[PDB]
Amino acid sequence: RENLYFQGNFDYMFKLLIIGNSSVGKTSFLFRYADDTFTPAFVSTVGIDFKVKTVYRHEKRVKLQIWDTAGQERYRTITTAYYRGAMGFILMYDITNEESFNAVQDWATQIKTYSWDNAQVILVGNKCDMEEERVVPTEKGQLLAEQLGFDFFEASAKENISVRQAFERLVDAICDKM
Amino acid sequence: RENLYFQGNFDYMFKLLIIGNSSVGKTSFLFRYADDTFTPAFVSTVGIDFKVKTVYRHEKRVKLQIWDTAGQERYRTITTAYYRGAMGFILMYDITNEESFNAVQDWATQIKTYSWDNAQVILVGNKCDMEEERVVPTEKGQLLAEQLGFDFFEASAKENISVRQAFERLVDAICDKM
Ligand SMILES: Nc1nc2c(ncn2[C@@H]2O[C@H](COP(=O)(O)OP(=O)(O)O)[C@@H](O)[C@H]2O)c(=O)[nH]1
Ligand SMILES: Nc1nc2c(ncn2[C@@H]2O[C@H](COP(=O)(O)OP(=O)(O)O)[C@@H](O)[C@H]2O)c(=O)[nH]1
């Protein structure tokens, strides 16, 4: 369902999705990864101002994509195409925002409904640079990740803490499964 | 509505679309351009087997995209997002297929309805390598192109005849307009 074409030849791509509440740092996290790896990102607009943000890694055969949460709430068909056949997820919350963490069960259900049976998930508590504003203890994140069957890390898009770790670890979980 | 992000910075991209009847050579034409320029193309699946095929040129700031005709017939919202804010079109027919040429008025209406007011269009008679199978005289293509306000070329994706000419000429029409 996701392919790369180059010089007459085709190969598969891993569809990896970053999801979570508006304003948890999904775009920042994707863009920090792009910047870290000297890769461009592409941003396309749907409707008034809803965004699709995409990074392609050629050698590594991964497509990383955000379809904004506010967009997912407005467009059913675009959203189901977005989730359909996703291989892995970064499921993101903000350690400084309790509601974003409370939404995780709901995002978990989203993953199982719409995406591949064996899709691997990493729960990421983002904004770990903002310790002074934390409201979600690390132990809550670790324990939910355990009961939902996800991997778990805290990260910082702003400080480049555990940004690469996330995607390389996700592809590894995917390959190990298959 | 189409942006590139690279190393902390943003710029605009030109959204260029290739449209026309199934099997006129749109994919072949896009892929030949990708191959000519040492660029990858990306192919994403919507529904059972409907494809979105995309080439990005970074330096030149152009996004070239096919959303399969059979897909356009099935998914309204995806299709309107596809056309919305298109800057230019390659409107393709097959010189060996009369129906594909008869559809051109209908594709022309499509362009005006759904896309930018000043969107530039090139009418391309593809498969010009197959002279022995021609059923659409060049003069018909030239005359329709004149009455619809389009540029016009015959081309061959298979033989690499007028493939680059098409996109570089399209961006030029776009810039000249603005
Ligand atoms: N301190 C800090 N702020 C962040 C981090 N990631 C994102 N932000 C900020 O959180 C807000 C939302 O980020 P954004 O990437 O747009 O979130 P999205 O809506 O989930 O895509 C913005 O003001 C970002 O600058 C982080 O790691 N640390
Ligand atoms: N002879 C010739 N055949 C072509 C050319 N372009 C496409 N084709 C063939 O026409 C058929 C449809 O091409 P495709 O690129 O899939 O058309 P699309 O459905 O419009 O994307 C395929 O068998 C292609 O190999 C061309 O320039 N010359």
Swiss-Prot record, chains A, B:
Reactions it catalyzes: GTP + H2O = GDP + phosphate + H(+)
Domain comment in the entry: Switch 1, switch 2 and the interswitch regions are characteristic of Rab GTPases and mediate the interactions with Rab downstream effectors. The switch regions undergo conformational changes upon nucleotide binding which drives interaction with specific sets of effector proteins, with most effectors only binding to GTP-bound Rab.
UniProt-listed Enzyme Commission number(s): 3.6.5.2
Cofactor: Mg(2+)
Keyword Protein biosynthesis recorded: no
Regulation of this protein's activity per its record: Regulated by guanine nucleotide exchange factors (GEFs) which promote the exchange of bound GDP for free GTP. Regulated by GTPase activating proteins (GAPs) which increase the GTP hydrolysis activity. Inhibited by GDP dissociation inhibitors (GDIs) which prevent Rab-GDP dissociation.
Positions contributing to Mg(2+) binding: T27, T45, D68
Organism domain of life: Eukaryota
Post-translational modification: Phosphorylation of Thr-77 in the switch II region by LRRK2 prevents the association of RAB regulatory proteins, including CHM, CHML and RAB GDP dissociation inhibitor GDI2.
Any single GO BP term: antigen processing and presentation
Compartments where located: Cell membrane; Golgi apparatus
Binding positions for GTP per the UniProt entry: 22-28, 40, 44, 71, 126-127, 129, 157-158
Binding site for GDP: S23, G25, K26, T27, S28, N126, K127, D129, M130, A157, K158
From-to range in the entire protein, with total length: 18 to 187 of 219
Single GO MF annotation: GTPase activity
Name by which UniProt lists this protein: Ras-related protein Rab-3B
Keywords: Acetylation, Cell membrane, Golgi apparatus, GTP-binding, Hydrolase, Lipoprotein, Membrane, Methylation, Nucleotide-binding, Phosphoprotein, Prenylation, Protein transport, Transport
Membrane topology: Lipid-anchor
Its job: The small GTPases Rab are key regulators of intracellular membrane trafficking, from the formation of transport vesicles to their fusion with membranes. Rabs cycle between an inactive GDP-bound form and an active GTP-bound form that is able to recruit to membranes different sets of downstream effectors directly responsible for vesicle formation, movement, tethering and fusion.
Gene Ontology CC: one annotated term: synaptic vesicle
